[PDB]
Amino acid sequence: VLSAADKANVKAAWGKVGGQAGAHGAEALERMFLGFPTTKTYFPHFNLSHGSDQVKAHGQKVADALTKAVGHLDDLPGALSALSDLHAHKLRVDPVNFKLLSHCLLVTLAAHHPDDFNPSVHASLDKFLANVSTVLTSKYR
Amino acid sequence: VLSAADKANVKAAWGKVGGQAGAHGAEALERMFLGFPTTKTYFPHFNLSHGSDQVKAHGQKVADALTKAVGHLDDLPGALSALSDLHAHKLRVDPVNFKLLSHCLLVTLAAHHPDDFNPSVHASLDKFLANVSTVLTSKYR
Amino acid sequence: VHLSAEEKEAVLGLWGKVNVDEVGGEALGRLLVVYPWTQRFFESFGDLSNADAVMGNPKVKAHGKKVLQSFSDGLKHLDNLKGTFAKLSELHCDQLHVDPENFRLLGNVIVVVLARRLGHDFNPDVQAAFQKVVAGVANALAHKYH
Amino acid sequence: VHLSAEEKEAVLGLWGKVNVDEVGGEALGRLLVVYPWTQRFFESFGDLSNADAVMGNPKVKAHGKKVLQSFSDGLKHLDNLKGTFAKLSELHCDQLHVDPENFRLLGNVIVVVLARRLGHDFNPDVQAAFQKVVAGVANALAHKYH
Numbered sequence: 134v135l136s137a138a139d140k141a142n143v144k145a146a147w148g149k150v151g152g153q154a155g156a157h158g159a160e161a162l163e164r165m166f167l168g169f170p171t172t173k174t175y176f177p178h179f180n181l182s183h184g185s186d187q188v189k190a191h192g193q194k195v196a197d198a199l200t201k202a203v204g205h206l207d208d209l210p211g212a213l214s215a216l217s218d219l220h221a222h223k224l225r226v227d228p229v230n231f232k233l234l235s236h237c238l239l240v241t242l243a244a245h246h247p248d249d250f251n252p253s254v255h256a257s258l259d260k261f262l263a264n265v266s267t268v269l270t271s272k273y274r
Numbered sequence: 275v276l277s278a279a280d281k282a283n284v285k286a287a288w289g290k291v292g293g294q295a296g297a298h299g300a301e302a303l304e305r306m307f308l309g310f311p312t313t314k315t316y317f318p319h320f321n322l323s324h325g326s327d328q329v330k331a332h333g334q335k336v337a338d339a340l341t342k343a344v345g346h347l348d349d350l351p352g353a354l355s356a357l358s359d360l361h362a363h364k365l366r367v368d369p370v371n372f373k374l375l376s377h378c379l380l381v382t383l384a385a386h387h388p389d390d391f392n393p394s395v396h397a398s399l400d401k402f403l404a405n406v407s408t409v410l411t412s413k414y415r
Numbered sequence: 416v417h418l419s420a421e422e423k424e425a426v427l428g429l430w431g432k433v434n435v436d437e438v439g440g441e442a443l444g445r446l447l448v449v450y451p452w453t454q455r456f457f458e459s460f461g462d463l464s465n466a467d468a469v470m471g472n473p474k475v476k477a478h479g480k481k482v483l484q485s486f487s488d489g490l491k492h493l494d495n496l497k498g499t500f501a502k503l504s505e506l507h508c509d510q511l512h513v514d515p516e517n518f519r520l521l522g523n524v525i526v527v528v529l530a531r532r533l534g535h536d537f538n539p540d541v542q543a544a545f546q547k548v549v550a551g552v553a554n555a556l557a558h559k560y561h
Numbered sequence: 562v563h564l565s566a567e568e569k570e571a572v573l574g575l576w577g578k579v580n581v582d583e584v585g586g587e588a589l590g591r592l593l594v595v596y597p598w599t600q601r602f603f604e605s606f607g608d609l610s611n612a613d614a615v616m617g618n619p620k621v622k623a624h625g626k627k628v629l630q631s632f633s634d635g636l637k638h639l640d641n642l643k644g645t646f647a648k649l650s651e652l653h654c655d656q657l658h659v660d661p662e663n664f665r666l667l668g669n670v671i672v673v674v675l676a677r678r679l680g681h682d683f684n685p686d687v688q689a690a691f692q693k694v695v696a697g698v699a700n701a702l703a704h705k706y707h
């Protein structure tokens with residue numbers, strides 16, 4: 134799974150994000166919609182203007198899913214079961230969109246916590262999101 | 275996630291390669307060196323001309339590690355953990371190059387087993403090769 | 416692409432042997448069963464519920480001939496792949512929302528179907544010229560992206 | 562790249578705020594820390610054997626400056642990115658054999674160092690303008706792939 138150093142960096146870094154988890158997931162989805170416009174198609178039902186309520190509310194759901202996964206770093210497949218089948222099977226999300234959101238979460242976190250995003254935290258949070266993306270993309274492979 | 279269907283197809287396809295495995299493993303490397311010249315950067319010690327014995331010998335080694343994987347599908351982590359250490363950790367080979375070799379293994383098999391490489395065997399082998407690449411690209415540290 | 420004289424001759428020479436219609440039905444049925452998220456764009460074609468339904472589906476087959484026939488106009492037009500494809504690159508980008516990496520996966524699925532059909536003719540040298548073309552094509556279909 | 566006028570102002574406006582000889586250094590060491598296979602290509606540079614060692618490395622800093630300088634040049638030639646980066650794609654392709662995927666990874670690590678260093682000023686809009694530029698430079702360093 135992650136090495137023990139990686140788990141420790143992921144847990145502390147997401148631990149000190151704290152209450153801002155919801156806000157960061159929200160701003161991560163905005164930076165992916167603007168920066169990568171092909172991703173706007175999965176959300177037509179939404180209003181995608183800066184500060185939209187649906188984007189704020191869904192931003193909390195994404196971060197709460199990443200706190201469950203920071204909580205169970207070894208139960209990661211079991212923990213994200215419903216979410217792997219909802220993404221691969223039901224929403225058929227293209228794999229690359231998970232590499233784009235992950236990029237916008239590392240940009241959001243650097244912007245808000247310059248202090249904490251040292252190079253090793255950065256490396257542990259990328260391996261953490263690449264393994265979260267592998268679980269969600271697992272019905273494809 | 276490599277399910278039963280894919281397990282059953284990997285075994286059968288590879289069954290039908292049989293003893294031509296090492297020939298395939300060498301054609302596939304030759305196609306890789308020809309189609310994407312950047313990969314050649316890792317073989318400066320090899321002679322990479324048309325059918326060098328070095329390429330054919332290394333071709334055999336890849337095809338025998340893929341047969342170990344085919345007899346260990348429930349746990350390629352264990353099966354390939356010394357090969358992980360060698361490519362990610364020790365030779366630092368770019369994760370992009372594993373899909374380029376996969377792709378070239380697939381063109382080789384198809385070219386050689388056309389009335390046997392059908393859609394479902396094509397997706398089973400492509401998830402198999404994507405799961406073997408994931409394992410050999412785990413230890414970057 | 417900056418393609419050599421040897422290689423054009425190699426690509427064109429061999430394209431004369433491929434029945435563009437049977438390989439396009441095939442490439443497209445295989446992209447949709449190998450890479451299952453690409454079915455998202457072809458929701459209307461119907462039962463794509465298993466590879467026998469996909470392959471044999473009249474619409475995947477009809478459509479496939481048309482992407483292979485666009486591939487052909489791109490062949491010898493190599494010098495100018497960016498305008499041959501400009502209409503379809505804005506079509507993909509702005510109308511269908513196809514992320515560009517799937518232009519690389521369909522290129523490579525055409526290459527294993529060409530390898531399946533032409534067998535020995537599709538040797539490592541002709542493959543190398545073809546990886547240049549399919550890279551060329553995707554790059555052009557990606558131009559109008561940003 | 563197709564940058565509107567509002568986007569080009571947002572990019573050149575953002576770029577006057579960049580300490581080139583602080584950003585480039587931090588971006589090439591994180592590339593080396595975060596995607597270790599890139600270390601292979603700089604192994605002539607010394608002790609790259611751990612985060613603080615990559616990050617404290619003289620040659621990593623001086624070469625990152627050079628890298629971010631090439632970005633600056635390219636920023637006042639957005640309509641002709643290919644031609645400003647043609648000699649440098651011959652260096653990367655022919656001589657260095659750097660896979661094109663890494664041009665993109667270094668492009669995005671520079672987008673993370675910029676958000677880290679500028680905070681609120683590297684807003685979602687500025688990022689989006691700037692992601693187009695990083696894609697154009699990535700394609701421009703990959704045009705000479707022989």
Ligand code: HEM
Nearest residue numbers: 172175176191194195198199216224226230231234235266
């Ligand atoms: C990599 C991090 C991701 C995580 C942790 C994640 C998590 C979630 C969660 C928690 C839900 C809510 C399900 C519910 O409780 O109703 C959801 C829904 C959804 N996600 Fe993701 N997601 C991720 C990536 C993506 C990506 C990359 C896309 C595609 C651009 C995407 C598209 C969607 C869509 C369309 C929904 C349904 C929204 C709705 O109908 O309200 N997600 N996701």
Ligand code: HEM
Nearest residue numbers: 313316317335336339340357361365367371372375376406
């Ligand atoms: C499909 C995945 C692959 C498998 C199954 C695999 C397997 C192996 C095996 C069995 C060895 C032999 C070592 C021994 O004799 O104990 C090896 C060595 C090596 N592999 Fe791979 N490999 C794979 C992909 C790659 C890729 C993509 C590259 C780079 C383009 C690569 C580069 C190397 C190098 C440079 C060596 C050392 C060569 C030497 O013996 O001097 N391998 N690999």
Ligand code: HEM
Nearest residue numbers: 453456457481482485486503511513517518521522552553
């Ligand atoms: C190198 C690859 C590609 C080529 C040359 C190509 C070519 C074409 C052509 C000929 C059309 C007809 C457009 C028109 O004039 O109305 C089209 C339609 C379409 N393409 Fe592609 N395409 C490519 C890849 C893709 C990929 C990979 C996807 C899917 C993930 C995609 C999705 C579509 C869709 C959804 C349509 C419309 C289908 C319909 O009629 O409902 N294309 N493409």
Ligand code: HEM
Nearest residue numbers: 599602603624627628631632652657659663664667668702
């Ligand atoms: C964002 C795109 C990039 C730009 C703008 C860029 C720019 C440059 C420049 C200005 C040079 C100096 C040329 C010379 O020595 O004459 C160069 C050299 C080099 N680049 Fe990059 N580069 C890029 C991406 C990469 C990537 C991702 C790699 C890593 C896999 C790479 C590896 C190298 C190497 C090995 C050198 C030689 C360094 C030396 O002199 O010791 N570059 N690059």
